[PDB]
Amino acid sequence: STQYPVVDHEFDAVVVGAGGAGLRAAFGLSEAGFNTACVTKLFPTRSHTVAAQGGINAALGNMEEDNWRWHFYDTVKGSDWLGDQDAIHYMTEQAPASVVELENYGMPFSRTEDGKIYQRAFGGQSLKFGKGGQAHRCCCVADRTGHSLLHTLYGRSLRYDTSYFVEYFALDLLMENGECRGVIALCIEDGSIHRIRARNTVVATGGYGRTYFSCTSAHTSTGDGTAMVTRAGLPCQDLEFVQFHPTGIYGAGCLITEGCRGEGGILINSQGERFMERYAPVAKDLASRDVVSRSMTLEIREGRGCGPEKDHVYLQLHHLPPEQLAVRLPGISETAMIFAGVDVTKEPIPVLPTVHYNMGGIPTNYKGQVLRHVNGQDQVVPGLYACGEAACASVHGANRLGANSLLDLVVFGRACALSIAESCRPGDKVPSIKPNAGEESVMNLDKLRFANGTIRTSELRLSMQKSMQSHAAVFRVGSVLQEGCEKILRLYGDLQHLKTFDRGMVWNTDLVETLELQNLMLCALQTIYGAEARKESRGAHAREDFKERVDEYDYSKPIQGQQKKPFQEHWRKHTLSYVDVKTGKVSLEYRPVIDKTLNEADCATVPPAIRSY
Amino acid sequence: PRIKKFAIYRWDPDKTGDKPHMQTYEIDLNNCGPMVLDALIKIKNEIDSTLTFRRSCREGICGSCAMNINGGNTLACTRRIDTNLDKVSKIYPLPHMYVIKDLVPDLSNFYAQYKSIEPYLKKKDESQEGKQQYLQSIEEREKLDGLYECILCACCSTSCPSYWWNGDKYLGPAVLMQAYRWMIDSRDDFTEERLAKLQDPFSLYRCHTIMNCTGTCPKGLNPGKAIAEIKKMMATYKE
Amino acid sequence: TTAKEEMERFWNKNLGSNRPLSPHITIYRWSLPMAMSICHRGTGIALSAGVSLFGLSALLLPGNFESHLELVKSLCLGPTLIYTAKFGIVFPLMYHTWNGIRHLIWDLGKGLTIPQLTQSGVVVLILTVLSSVGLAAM
Amino acid sequence: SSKAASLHWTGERVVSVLLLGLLPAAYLNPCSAMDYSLAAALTLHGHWGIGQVVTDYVRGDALQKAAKAGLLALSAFTFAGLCYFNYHDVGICKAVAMLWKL
């Protein structure tokens, strides 16, 4: 009000996110013939998708002869049958098409004797629907795949007339009568507020990894778009499901990729025993993301930890040929020398299971459309889309399969573009926003700017991160989760007791990180409350109280003379969480998982089975 | 107890009459992480939250924390603080750049130069693309090694005086290296016209082999080697 | 927006504002391969100024070269002093000669790595001293 | 697209190896013909040498053209002076030899 200058922008589509998914959705719309705006708080290259080291999944059949339907089974078995099979069908079929596209865009993939894209073994992937051993379909750019992905995606995106709002912190979704009208954003450069309105809006803000103390994700991975959807009265899906990557530096928390356990890497504990072969029969340390990390953290509970504190594990890269380590794993070769101070060829690397990926986020179709939940039924929110880590199409379900997120990025980023392309034309009436709309977003900005509270911003962030790390770890008990719920509940009330020192317009990092803190809390509340509500051990979410697989049936015995359980009695359903913005009460509904595929004849529906590798 | 002195460049654009001045902070190294960014985060979180700087991955692959540490343009999360308590660490923004606020340089020109070289694959026949993967041999891929790893942190370009005295016209090592990165790529067919884009004195030939670019690279890349390799291609190319 | 339009709006914003330039020569650390680049210009410009002074004086100032040599003998030829006089001419010349070859090696692309820059740099720096002292005593 | 900037670069390297090849040639073979070839290479290399200095530091549309015109006149007077020194006077090969044993 008189202090902040409001500037209205008129576009056909707005894409919040400059990384992989959002970036592909941005220029993908521009290629279709749309005037697309791209709001992002970082520079497109500074996005996280860069930190990706493992690879990108595609059943091209370059190592051995492969089928995308075998990749379908691995993604659905990995999802512990919470995964929406209509999306898994759509992703695995578009898998080879999108990677071939990326290679033609300019992505310098590693090569073989044939000259084709180099694929290699990765976490929990198999041939012949889980009957033909280990599958090699993880396409990589030699330990720097995501870095090479984002650059060649951005490089290609300069070709089209896309208006990039670089360094713009998006505050909230512009909403009018249950319809998305655009985005309200803060320009970091001068401290002005901009209202970029459009007929459609795509959200790709990434995960909320910074909710925890020890995570592999960047400082800018605060889950802003998830909170924007949260503040708009729209549900968030499966927020309790949080991935713990098995391997990562004990110190800073940086990632040592699962590319190691695939090229020929082994895991060793205090005694020197290959402990992963004890927990997994014919899978070893090449099993699922959750199963490997589950064993690693359990080895610490026994007292069989490594180091001076005996609270971490070891990664064996000693026996691997030095000729292989320099070519296939150069990215971890340098970073382990810098942070850990450990030689990669002559010494084993210290590792510890840390927060990595968020399966949940914004409820999504197989097309990319954001879903609300009215009267126990799916309903499409007009002019709103989501793709990538920030979205929950549940193509990853309960547990994300290794090297599937960069695929989740390109395929569903492309889907978000094609949904606006094939339905609705460019130049169509840009829906009118209220002459007042955005008042609450401006008042929220002004409140945090002149903040004279009792608690410092970082001192409140520390309380959130340590509470989530201890009360919502790999193993979580209902007794610990109950205390963890009310602890985060009180910390939400402290968001009006916070102090901000920097009171400027141009580049206020003291303000935007406090805005990130507000957005982290809204993600933190729905994660902890959803975790204590779910009473089962499915994928990443594993309860000490209830270690059972609560499906519609007991799939240990064949279903034929067995009776079905009611919907509100079994846990094979999506957790849809809401939260009242003012009070901070988390109320949560549930919706059924999609089991039917896009075509039963072309790709078979996979029924629930005994989840074990 | 092990206190460490930090001298940091400070300027507030939201205050009238504020000139560029140095600010001193004392931090215990036992409570802090090994790297420079850890200390920058620590004083931000504990001492003075008025400090404003770029950070993201803290891994050394995003290239946000690009700044001048002790007279050298390297990443703050890659370089560690000197444990020697006698020496005071001097933290500065990237040399000869317009300061927005506290160690945050305006890289608008840097990114715009990267756009001018066209950093994307260009085929003569683009009607058959997006359906099959292009063939590239293991040797042809090895030519891209030591080139694609560029983070675009703008440490090498901001280190040479030729980008200081001639910022507008001269592209700089980072941008020129990427132009070369697309030249040797066997998939690219526009190699001849990429070289024809540098046929002016300022764009490429403003380099004098001063070798400040490759000496300051955080990733250990050699832009100078590539720049001199462009000059060889420029001297000898068909038509 | 285009490629060059962003460059135009870069200069049209910063020059119309009150943003300061981050220090460059005041803060950056002095390195040998970089310091040898400045001296190559320092010798280059001064050495070209020597030739320019030699040509212009021969064209403008009267009298032949043999008569000008007798004018130098008016200082009575100091044995140690005239050695220093000829030394201050071959020193900038021979430094620029040996380092000039090093630049020509760089143009071929050989020895552009950091260790090889310091290795070939000391070679030139030492050859400078030897060729400057050696040719002064003739 | 015409390649003019690339040919100028190679031209600077052509005179560089030419001027490097003349210094031992003037010592071993000091003659009237060597006087002019050393003068033609010494003034051309310098002209493109300072030409590189003007392009670096001299800022502006009016200043750079004024400096390039001034350098062209300075170089022309330098080459004409040395040729006059080779024809009517001793000649740089024999002239530096007289200064050498002094």
Ligand SMILES: *Cc1cc2c(cc1C)nc1c(=O)[nH]c(=O)nc-1n2C[C@H](O)[C@H](O)[C@H](O)COP(=O)(O)OP(=O)(O)OC[C@H]1O[C@@H](n2cnc3c(N)ncnc32)[C@H](O)[C@@H]1O
């Ligand atoms: C953490 C991590 C993840 C990871 C990985 C390694 C690490 C350390 N390695 C991977 C791999 O090898 N293969 C793979 O398939 N996935 C891997 N991952 C996971 C993956 O990288 C991420 O899930 C994915 O890249 C996320 O992409 P996305 O583009 O959707 O999200 P982002 O990279 O975090 O980018 C966020 C963008 O959104 C903009 N933004 C955020 N907030 C705002 C607000 N406030 N206003 C305006 N814009 C905003 C940012 O600008 C940013 O560009």
Ligand code: HEM
């Ligand atoms: C035979 C010995 C010489 C060699 C090998 C040589 C070589 C070179 C080279 C290759 C350069 C360009 C450096 C670059 O790549 O930027 C240069 C610079 C220069 N040279 Fe020489 N040169 C020699 C003698 C001379 C002499 C005697 C003069 C004086 C008339 C001279 C005048 C200049 C000038 C004015 C420059 C300025 C260019 C710059 O430093 O940017 N050179 N020399």
Ligand SMILES: CC(C)Oc1cccc(NC(=O)c2ccccc2I)c1
């Ligand atoms: C940090 C200081 C030492 O840095 C400086 C300052 C001033 C000039 C220079 N030197 C050049 O500018 C230079 C030298 C040779 C060839 C081309 C050049 I553009 C370096």
Ligand code: SF4
């Ligand atoms: S070449 Fe090296 S120093 Fe230059 S921008 Fe790239 S990573 Fe940074």
Ligand code: F3S
């Ligand atoms: S001007 Fe340049 S590209 Fe390297 S050689 Fe010097 S920094």
Ligand code: FES
């Ligand atoms: S913050 Fe990513 S490189 Fe320093």
